[PDB]
Amino acid sequence: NPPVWKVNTNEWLDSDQYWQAFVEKHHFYSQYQPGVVDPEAPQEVEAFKQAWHSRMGKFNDRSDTPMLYAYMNELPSWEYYDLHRSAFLEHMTYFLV
Amino acid sequence: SNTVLSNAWFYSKTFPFGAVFYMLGSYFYRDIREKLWKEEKSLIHTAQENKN
């Protein structure tokens, strides 16, 4: 073979039919995947998961910098029971009995 | 047949920007090339070792 750094990139990819499919998967079927050699690797997967959780938390959580928590007069179940622990207990003993 | 080389634009933008780029390139000629070629060198090393 020739040296792979001397070889033209598109010629290598034309020769290889497997890594063609690897590129199509991440860069044709998506537009926001990182330009790293291995986007399916565990570091990337776990980073995506942590980013997902942090984004959803920042959006939905009750905080000092609230995005969605605003104009609250009738609360939902989770926030109601998280703020009013007296009512969670009463509503729960009644349910079990 | 023009005033292009005698211009306020020339003396304010063309000569300063160009001269600064030239001076910086001359002074950091090798630093830049090394910082760019680091990745390529590492990749070539990795490929050769894997092959061997």
Partner: peptide, 22 residues
């Protein structure tokens, strides 16, 4: 044009202020 050669040596060049003379 293609880069021919069997060599794995990553080679770069620096230039001088003199021209090649034959």
């Amino acid at each position: 044009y293609a880069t021919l050669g069997s060599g794995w040596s990553f080679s770069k060049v620096q230039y001088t202020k003199y021209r090649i003379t034959k």
